[PDB]
């Protein structure tokens, strides 16, 4: 169902859309690489912190690597809950450490990476102008040029 992109650019009002889509994907590739770098960095520390609490947290949280991936992925969208840091053993020190770590990850990663992405995309846009028609024409040319020979 996603393979429909072949027969999309032949139309008028849809080419430049697809072209800028591909451009922004190729751009955000590198931001994705840096974000997964920092993701790995935070997730290893978060799996080491609660490695010796099997059945001590409120929810089934920060017990194995798969679960750490789950929570740190689904918190990027606000779908994960803060109650995934509360404990049952008192150990107030480790509890504050975890709250601090989770918060600082949240702020740093999410906010700074998003603002970097958008400011740099407006940067990469403002330098190149008026040739989107040209790029759409080149793409459409490849498209209905591939139908001639055989």
């Amino acid at each position: 169902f996603s393979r429909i992109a072949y027969i999309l650019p032949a139309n008028e009002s849809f080419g430049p859309l697809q072209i800028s889509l591909g451009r922004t994907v190729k751009d955000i590739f590198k931001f994705m690489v840096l974000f997964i770098m920092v993701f790995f960095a935070f997730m290893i520390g978060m799996f080491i912190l609660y490695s010796y609490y099997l059945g001590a947290k409120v929810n089934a949280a920060f017990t194995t690597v798969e679960e750490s991936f789950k929570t740190l992925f689904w918190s990027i969208f606000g779908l994960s809950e803060v109650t995934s840091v509360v404990l049952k053993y008192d150990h107030k020190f480790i509890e504050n450490i975890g709250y601090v770590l989770y918060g600082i990850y949240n702020v740093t990663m999410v906010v700074v990476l998003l603002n970097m992405l958008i400011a740099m995309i407006n940067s990469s846009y403002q330098e190149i102008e008026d040739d989107s028609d040209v790029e759409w024409k080149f793409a459409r040319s490849k498209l209905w040029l591939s139908y001639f020979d055989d």
């Binding site: 290893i44 799996f47 080491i48 490695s51």
Partner: peptide, 21 residues
């Protein structure tokens, strides 16, 4: 990371950070 998941590794990490310092 190897020390993370399941005595020598502990001392090696300590020696490495002492070298950094």
């Amino acid at each position: 990371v190897f020390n993370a998941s399941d005595t020598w590794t502990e001392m090696l990490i300590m020696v490495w950070v002492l070298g950094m310092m």
